[PDB]
């Protein structure tokens, strides 16, 4: 067999990520699923498309859907783009070379935000897995992990190498000391989810779930054990929805600062920061207004605090966009005007400009200067078709019909149509015919670029499907009104010929290639096959548990496939209505199935974002295609069979073209290393009057002590037994040194005792025979403080036991009844005394 | 879900919720969207013939047949206000609690752990604070901090001392804390604290065992003497 | 007396006497302890087309 690969993928202008504006209005960088698009805002044409490689469907390509870009960040000075993907992988890209430079992998979920340091050598990444990691570009490594957060990182601020502020979806704002890798302060920003963070000098603003917005001062050098961040005051934005992003920009000439609170809805609310003189000016007048109103000074003082927020921030303007906004960025700041760029969820970019003078803007609403909408389509493409010439691809959606060029990948024409559901080319490729949901049928001509005819009452309900005879002179239309209607082409206008009424709703209608059969799907899960010429009922296929969504008939009019929402593809021998085999193809409803022309091989597409290449005669999946990120709604196959076109819910059109040591022994090495150093320092100190240890960062006393701990007790007595005598003197010299450090001695007193006394008992005879005076003194020293260290603990135990008896004795006095008769005292004590039951044999 | 006949039904919270009174004497608050019982209010012991509402049900008044009036008031936002404030305080204490250890301010960190009741962190405070002591009991500041402990905090601490005592690897931390308590608190008062005795009664038998041990460690240490006297010969 | 359950649901108490409040515990520890619990217990028309 021959392999299908993704030749090209287009129709996407902006996916679900942030947009980066780069000066030359300049260009824009936007996310297109697994690829990044560089546009020219002035012209509306693509500049360059960044594709890592490994085209989907190739053998070396992974058998999983590609990881989509989630965040973009570019360092203008160095011309680097670092791209975050939904798999947690950061790829540093060279804009000039348009190639991957570095590939960081340290996250387990989607990357949410990314931010270069000022110098552009260090990269900070926050991911949905709640971790902030700081990466080194020159070092190509992950330096340290900040893990205090308990949910996806919504925002963080780090402009100076000393300090880092972070937010998260769990409602915490946290401070981070970059030099310590630890969390210093913690405040609950908002009652629910804390989404936004923006910082200018001390001023800090964050957004919760509601319209409440908080103001904080950042006294970085406060250093009081608290209050480095304090709540200042709250103000309410107009929109009731959450605020995702906030960004500042300062006008150099007038030193004016502005910021916007990007909501979840179609509203962007801009703001101004008042100057210090303006605040004092405003304060003095307001005091007079309240003083004129006759309030007390104390109330006035409180009110100015209660009205604190009003003095700094001025609601400047609100941008209202037709389509839900996804992300935004300031573009240029000047005295004359303010410019913004944003992206929507409807696959478009919008450039908004705001002319303003002094306090308030000149216009009631912003001026929309540029828009990029030609090369993409707002609503999902519900049905597609390929012209017989295999040159023109028609894509029909709610509210619009566009026509594409397959070689060049550049749209030619656009038509405004109803809620499209099914579209097909008329023979010759000069006209297109469309099925609207409201029951209307539309006919368009490419050359005129205008709609020719409309049949408003073609059906009372949605025209779910539509098909043409091979001759192209008859049209079959299937609708939810439980009817099928045949239309003829007469010079061009459509004449209704006849109606066929059915018992149930109609979902698909397919006329066989030789124009002898008519297959009709229904909502009762039954496919009915008719004779086209005579309309005589022929067969009734049965066996889909859910309604059949698509049907197709082999080129030789022998095999007919049925694909249903019950996740099954059933291949039926048309001669007798026998089903050869039922395939459990996709994990979710299978939407469209098409035969490759001149063969029994066919393609299948479902909601699972997977397109599968099947083999008609052996009934096996030849290949699995994972390229789309979401539902694949429609599918088409070229008449030649050279390529297959799939369009999905992600607004993307894709073209598929055909091509060790044991206990005892470890202790000896520990003794040699530790005591070699201890003797080394002692000799060094006496005259004045290693790599392993520094790597673990432990003093020689500890290093050996830890190794003793690691030895399991069941091996400890045997481990010491193996030891030659020459190491015992080393071991005794160890305990001597441990005695000076009183902390270690009492931390591990019981262990030191058991090993020490066991060493002495085992090789007592050789120990005493030695005449070394220095050994005698060490046993003198090691003896004395061992008694004191033991006696010290023993003294504590003795004092407590006697006192606790006294306390027990004294309570037993006040509150315990006493019987003069001893027999009565016996019974009372037995009842009072604790009882425990034990199993007995 | 009503055990007996329902005699009143009223909408509250606009469409969201419904309240119903039954002969059982139980007032049940239902969720219209889900049809599930969010809350049950029980302030009567007989059938309820009257149920009046105000402010979308922010004030509810229900009558028992015997003649008992319950004047219910909505307090959801108030309870939410309380927990938010309590939560805001809790975060501050914890963040401070971690911060003190990194500096090592044991005298303060003991208080925060005692209030927050983190049995691990309290233990590490005493242990590494005790380590510094080796180089009256713990140190002057922290010993004072123990002395100020009230009746509730002593019981909680003595519970922690009891458990730590049972383990032979951590008893040394327990005994010194108990010693600090007897030396800086009125023994008369400790006896009268309810339940301290049952806590105390458990401490003694484990303490005696630890005394029998250690003593043998002193005893069995005299091998070093016998080693020395041999060497002198 | 034998060290048993935590009286407060939040706290976690082991047989060795080590006590643990769920608040202090870092997330990995909670998983590790939960796994440790696991092993200990084991031994004992529009919608369709669119």
CSV table of N, CA and C in Angstrom, one decimal, chain A residues 41-98:
chain,number,residue,atom,x,y,z
A,41,UNK,N,-0.1,42.6,9.6
A,41,UNK,CA,-1.4,43.2,9.9
A,41,UNK,C,-1.9,44.1,8.9
A,42,UNK,N,-0.9,44.8,8.2
A,42,UNK,CA,-1.3,45.8,7.1
A,42,UNK,C,-2.0,45.0,6.0
A,43,UNK,N,-1.3,44.0,5.5
A,43,UNK,CA,-1.8,43.3,4.3
A,43,UNK,C,-2.8,42.2,4.6
A,44,UNK,N,-2.7,41.5,5.7
A,44,UNK,CA,-3.6,40.4,6.0
A,44,UNK,C,-3.1,39.1,5.4
A,45,UNK,N,-1.9,39.0,5.0
A,45,UNK,CA,-1.3,37.8,4.4
A,45,UNK,C,-0.3,37.1,5.4
A,46,UNK,N,-0.2,35.8,5.3
A,46,UNK,CA,0.8,35.1,6.1
A,46,UNK,C,2.2,35.4,5.7
A,47,UNK,N,3.1,35.6,6.7
A,47,UNK,CA,4.5,35.9,6.4
A,47,UNK,C,5.3,34.6,6.4
A,48,UNK,N,5.2,33.8,7.4
A,48,UNK,CA,5.9,32.6,7.5
A,48,UNK,C,5.2,31.7,8.5
A,49,UNK,N,5.3,30.4,8.3
A,49,UNK,CA,4.6,29.4,9.2
A,49,UNK,C,5.7,28.5,9.7
A,50,UNK,N,5.7,28.4,11.1
A,50,UNK,CA,6.7,27.7,11.8
A,50,UNK,C,6.2,26.2,12.0
A,51,UNK,N,6.9,25.3,11.4
A,51,UNK,CA,6.5,23.9,11.6
A,51,UNK,C,7.7,23.0,12.0
A,52,UNK,N,7.6,22.4,13.1
A,52,UNK,CA,8.7,21.6,13.6
A,52,UNK,C,9.2,20.5,12.7
A,53,UNK,N,8.2,19.8,12.1
A,53,UNK,CA,8.5,18.7,11.2
A,53,UNK,C,7.6,17.5,11.6
A,54,UNK,N,8.0,16.3,11.1
A,54,UNK,CA,7.3,15.1,11.4
A,54,UNK,C,5.9,15.1,11.0
A,55,UNK,N,5.6,15.2,9.7
A,55,UNK,CA,4.2,15.5,9.2
A,55,UNK,C,3.3,14.3,9.7
A,56,UNK,N,2.1,14.6,10.1
A,56,UNK,CA,1.2,13.5,10.6
A,56,UNK,C,1.0,12.4,9.6
A,57,UNK,N,0.9,11.2,10.1
A,57,UNK,CA,0.7,10.0,9.2
A,57,UNK,C,2.0,9.3,8.8
A,58,UNK,N,3.1,10.0,8.8
A,58,UNK,CA,4.4,9.3,8.5
A,58,UNK,C,4.7,8.3,9.6
A,59,UNK,N,5.5,7.3,9.2
A,59,UNK,CA,5.8,6.2,10.1
A,59,UNK,C,6.5,6.8,11.4
A,60,UNK,N,7.4,7.7,11.1
A,60,UNK,CA,8.2,8.3,12.3
A,60,UNK,C,7.3,9.2,13.1
A,61,UNK,N,6.2,9.7,12.5
A,61,UNK,CA,5.2,10.5,13.2
A,61,UNK,C,4.6,9.8,14.4
A,62,UNK,N,4.4,10.4,15.5
A,62,UNK,CA,3.9,9.8,16.7
A,62,UNK,C,2.4,9.4,16.4
A,63,UNK,N,1.9,8.3,17.0
A,63,UNK,CA,0.6,7.9,17.0
A,63,UNK,C,-0.4,8.6,18.0
A,64,UNK,N,-0.1,9.9,18.3
A,64,UNK,CA,-1.0,10.7,19.1
A,64,UNK,C,-1.2,12.0,18.5
A,65,UNK,N,-2.3,12.7,18.9
A,65,UNK,CA,-2.6,14.0,18.3
A,65,UNK,C,-1.5,14.9,18.6
A,66,UNK,N,-1.1,15.8,17.7
A,66,UNK,CA,0.0,16.7,18.0
A,66,UNK,C,-0.3,17.6,19.2
A,67,UNK,N,0.7,18.0,19.9
A,67,UNK,CA,0.5,18.9,21.0
A,67,UNK,C,0.3,20.3,20.5
A,68,UNK,N,-0.8,21.0,20.9
A,68,UNK,CA,-1.1,22.3,20.4
A,68,UNK,C,-0.3,23.3,21.2
A,69,UNK,N,0.0,24.4,20.6
A,69,UNK,CA,0.6,25.6,21.2
A,69,UNK,C,-0.4,26.2,22.2
A,70,UNK,N,0.1,26.5,23.4
A,70,UNK,CA,-0.7,27.2,24.4
A,70,UNK,C,-0.2,28.6,24.7
A,71,UNK,N,1.1,28.8,24.7
A,71,UNK,CA,1.6,30.2,25.0
A,71,UNK,C,2.8,30.5,24.1
A,72,UNK,N,2.9,31.8,23.9
A,72,UNK,CA,4.0,32.3,23.0
A,72,UNK,C,4.7,33.5,23.8
A,73,UNK,N,6.0,33.5,23.7
A,73,UNK,CA,6.8,34.6,24.3
A,73,UNK,C,8.0,34.8,23.4
A,74,UNK,N,8.2,36.1,23.0
A,74,UNK,CA,9.4,36.4,22.2
A,74,UNK,C,10.2,37.5,22.9
A,75,UNK,N,11.5,37.4,22.9
A,75,UNK,CA,12.4,38.4,23.4
A,75,UNK,C,12.9,39.2,22.2
A,76,UNK,N,12.4,40.5,22.2
A,76,UNK,CA,12.6,41.3,21.0
A,76,UNK,C,14.1,41.6,20.7
A,77,UNK,N,14.8,41.7,21.8
A,77,UNK,CA,16.2,42.1,21.6
A,77,UNK,C,17.0,41.0,20.9
A,78,UNK,N,16.8,39.7,21.3
A,78,UNK,CA,17.5,38.6,20.8
A,78,UNK,C,16.9,37.9,19.6
A,79,UNK,N,15.6,38.2,19.4
A,79,UNK,CA,14.9,37.5,18.3
A,79,UNK,C,14.8,36.0,18.5
A,80,UNK,N,14.3,35.6,19.7
A,80,UNK,CA,14.0,34.2,20.0
A,80,UNK,C,12.5,34.1,20.3
A,81,UNK,N,11.9,33.0,19.9
A,81,UNK,CA,10.5,32.6,20.2
A,81,UNK,C,10.5,31.3,21.0
A,82,UNK,N,10.0,31.3,22.2
A,82,UNK,CA,9.9,30.1,23.0
A,82,UNK,C,8.4,29.8,23.1
A,83,UNK,N,8.0,28.6,22.7
A,83,UNK,CA,6.7,28.2,22.4
A,83,UNK,C,6.3,27.1,23.4
A,84,UNK,N,5.2,27.2,24.1
A,84,UNK,CA,4.7,26.2,25.1
A,84,UNK,C,3.6,25.4,24.4
A,85,UNK,N,3.7,24.1,24.6
A,85,UNK,CA,2.7,23.2,24.0
A,85,UNK,C,1.9,22.5,25.1
A,86,UNK,N,0.7,22.0,24.7
A,86,UNK,CA,-0.2,21.4,25.7
A,86,UNK,C,0.4,20.2,26.4
A,87,UNK,N,1.5,19.6,25.9
A,87,UNK,CA,2.1,18.5,26.5
A,87,UNK,C,3.1,18.9,27.6
A,88,UNK,N,3.3,20.2,27.8
A,88,UNK,CA,4.3,20.6,28.8
A,88,UNK,C,5.7,20.8,28.2
A,89,UNK,N,5.8,20.9,26.9
A,89,UNK,CA,7.1,20.9,26.3
A,89,UNK,C,7.4,22.3,25.7
A,90,UNK,N,8.5,22.9,26.1
A,90,UNK,CA,8.9,24.3,25.7
A,90,UNK,C,9.9,24.1,24.6
A,91,UNK,N,9.7,24.7,23.4
A,91,UNK,CA,10.6,24.7,22.3
A,91,UNK,C,11.1,26.2,22.0
A,92,UNK,N,12.4,26.4,22.2
A,92,UNK,CA,13.0,27.7,21.9
A,92,UNK,C,13.3,27.8,20.4
A,93,UNK,N,12.7,28.8,19.7
A,93,UNK,CA,12.7,28.8,18.2
A,93,UNK,C,13.6,30.0,17.8
A,94,UNK,N,14.3,29.8,16.7
A,94,UNK,CA,15.0,30.9,16.1
A,94,UNK,C,14.1,31.5,15.0
A,95,UNK,N,13.8,32.8,15.2
A,95,UNK,CA,13.0,33.5,14.1
A,95,UNK,C,13.7,33.6,12.8
A,96,UNK,N,15.0,34.0,12.9
A,96,UNK,CA,15.8,34.1,11.7
A,96,UNK,C,15.9,32.8,10.9
A,97,UNK,N,16.3,31.7,11.7
A,97,UNK,CA,16.5,30.4,11.1
A,97,UNK,C,15.2,29.6,11.0
A,98,UNK,N,14.1,30.1,11.7
A,98,UNK,CA,12.8,29.4,11.7
A,98,UNK,C,13.0,27.9,12.0
